[PDB]
Amino acid sequence: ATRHPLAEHTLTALVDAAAHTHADRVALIADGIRLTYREVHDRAGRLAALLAERGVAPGDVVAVALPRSADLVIALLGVLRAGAAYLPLDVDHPPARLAAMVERARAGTVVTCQGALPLPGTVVVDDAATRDRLAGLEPLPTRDVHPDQLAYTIFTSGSEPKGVGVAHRAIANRLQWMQHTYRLTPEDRVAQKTPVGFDVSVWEFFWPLITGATLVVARPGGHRDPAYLAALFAEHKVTVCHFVPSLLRVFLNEPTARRATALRQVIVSGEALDADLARAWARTLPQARLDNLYGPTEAAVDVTSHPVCGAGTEPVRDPVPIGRPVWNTELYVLDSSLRPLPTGAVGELYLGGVQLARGYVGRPGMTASRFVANPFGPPGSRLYRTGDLVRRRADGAVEYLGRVDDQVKINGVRVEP
Amino acid sequence: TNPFDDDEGVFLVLVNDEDQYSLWPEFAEVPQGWRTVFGPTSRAAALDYINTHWTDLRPRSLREAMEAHS
Numbered sequence: 001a002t003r004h005p006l007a008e009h010t011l012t013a014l015v016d017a018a019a020h021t022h023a024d025r026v027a028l029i030a031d032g033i034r035l036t037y038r039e040v041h042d043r044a045g046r047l048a049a050l051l052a053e054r055g056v057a058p059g060d061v062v063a064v065a066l067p068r069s070a071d072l073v074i075a076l077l078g079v080l081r082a083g084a085a086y087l088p089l090d091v092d093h094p095p096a097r098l099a100a101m102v103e104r105a106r107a108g109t110v111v112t113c114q115g116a117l118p119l120p121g122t123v124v125v126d127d128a129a130t131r132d133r134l135a136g137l138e139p140l141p142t143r144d145v146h147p148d149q150l151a152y153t154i155f156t157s158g159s160e161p162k163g164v165g166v167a168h169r170a171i172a173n174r175l176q177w178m179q180h181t182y183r184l185t186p187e188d189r190v191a192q193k194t195p196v197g198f199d200v201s202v203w204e205f206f207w208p209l210i211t212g213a214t215l216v217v218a219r220p221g222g223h224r225d226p227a228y229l230a231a232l233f234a235e236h237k238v239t240v241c242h243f244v245p246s247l248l249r250v251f252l253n254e255p256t257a258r259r260a261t262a263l264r265q266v267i268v269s270g271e272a273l274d275a276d277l278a279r280a281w282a283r284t285l286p287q288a289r290l291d292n293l294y295g296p297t298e299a300a301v302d303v304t305s306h307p308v309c310g311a312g313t314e315p316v317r318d319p320v321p322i323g324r325p326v327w328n329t330e331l332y333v334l335d336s337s338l339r340p341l342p343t344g345a346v347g348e349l350y351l352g353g354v355q356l357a358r359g360y361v362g363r364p365g366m367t368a369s370r371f372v373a374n375p376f377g378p379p380g381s382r383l384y385r386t387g388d389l390v391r392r393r394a395d396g397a398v399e400y401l402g403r404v405d406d407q408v409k410i411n412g413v414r415v416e417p
Numbered sequence: 418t419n420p421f422d423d424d425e426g427v428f429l430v431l432v433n434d435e436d437q438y439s440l441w442p443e444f445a446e447v448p449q450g451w452r453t454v455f456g457p458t459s460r461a462a463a464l465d466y467i468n469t470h471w472t473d474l475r476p477r478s479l480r481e482a483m484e485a486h487s
């Protein structure tokens with residue numbers, strides 16, 4: 001019973017509302033400088049105008065290949081402003097992989113910069129002629145966006161990688177739920193440290209920017225260096241961040257992690273969270289609450305959450321639950337005959353509700369095999385089969401137990417052997 | 418092993434009012450709001466039907482909205 005009204009149904013509406021309300025606040029701390037909401041949105045509007053004059057229209061997919069920087073943030077916002085979905089390309093991946101993603105997603109435009117240049121429709125934002133054109137365009141008024149148009153297409157490993165298309169409506173639900181639950185204020189500082197190809201980065205970019213809070217952008221590669229992260233967090237009094245379980249362990253093994261005393265909420269997702277790691281977190285940073293979130297890329301970043309560390313939490317023990325569904329989301333634990341299991345029995349987690357992705361771009365057969373008809377929901381609805389073995393506890397919280405298949409995680413990255 | 422991955426299963430293809438498609442094992446009751454358009458047949462033949470018939474993953478309502486912009 002997670003039904004909940006949504007104030008807005010698109011990410012562009014949420015970002016635009018914040019840009020008006022918080023115009024003269026700092027939006028970004030990045031690259032050694034500070035940009036206000038007004039400045040970030042003026043630059044994103046110029047880029048949207050340039051994209052539109054190059055043929056980008058609502059419904060299109062625009063690839064983005066920029067290192068973590070202010071220009072990356074502006075690019076994502078500019079793509080959305082133009083009515084298009086963004087396809088993030090991690091400039092670390094090899095060229096052949098990036099080219100195949102652009103082809104499968106039918107991205108006709110690639111936004112990049114000179115450093116990360118070495119594909120059809122390349123826009124090089126720091127080319128002299130392009131800088132001059134951006135300065136000579138009026139910021140574009142946000143296009144009208146239908147909630148079922150895509151906001152982003154993110155590739156995951158494929159047993160050929162699959163491109164998951166996630167609609168505006170799905171990510172609007174996910175981000176408004178997050179803000180209701182953890183309540184960023186304009187004084188908050190969330191760190192941008194997750195690679196842009198992992199869908200956790202979607203809320204790092206956009207949650208602070210729909211609330212008036214400040215995004216603190218780590219340098220490219222800095223997510224690999226825990227002493228650098230602890231230094232960045234102390235310097236800018238970062239209050240909210242994410243870790244994957246294996247990199248949380250690396251962070252807590254760093255002597256200066258205890259200097260991140262401004263942290264008030266950390267989100268952990270992507271792999272199973274062990275109880276000894278949660279206990280170690282609470283010994284190192286007692287004032288920082290810790291929540292375990294779970295979900296596949298196919299259902300808009302996370303579908304469940306559980307409070308693990310902080311006032312009011314239960315004593316931690318293994319398995320640490322993945323918790324209870326977010327807004328407008330349903331969880332079913334099914335057997336191999338597609339029947340619901342009684343409480344406590346192990347079966348496979350199936351997901352329903354507003355956050356399901358449209359499907360895998362260009363792959364109807366694969367889509368229909370994993371986003372399947374829903375016996376339980378309204379007529380015509382679908383379920384996503386996760387491949388995760390779970391059980392529901394007496395009190396209703398769900399526990400992750402393992403995989404039905406051979407899928408693995410490296411450092412939070414989904415890898416299909 | 419998940420029934421939708423069973424290469425030796427017997428399958429239907431279902432479509433909803435939004436013209437989205439689902440693979441479906443013949444042993445399970447067809448959910449409300451979905452109609453059988455192909456099968457019973459092999460998994461491979463069901464997936465071939467889907468790959469040749471579902472050429473636009475947008476929900477029908479979104480496609481019709483986009484066509485009406487003209």
Ligand SMILES: Nc1ncnc2c1ncn2[C@@H]1O[C@H](COP(=O)(O)OC(=O)[C@@H](N)CO)[C@@H](O)[C@H]1O
Nearest residue numbers: 269270271272293294295296297301302400414
């Ligand atoms: N809290 C957790 N406990 C155990 N396993 C988890 C988990 N969160 C994610 N996973 C595993 O990561 C898979 C999703 O991986 P991915 O799509 O890369 O998305 C992601 O990982 C991000 N969208 C999660 O924020 C899940 O199906 C599950 O196997």
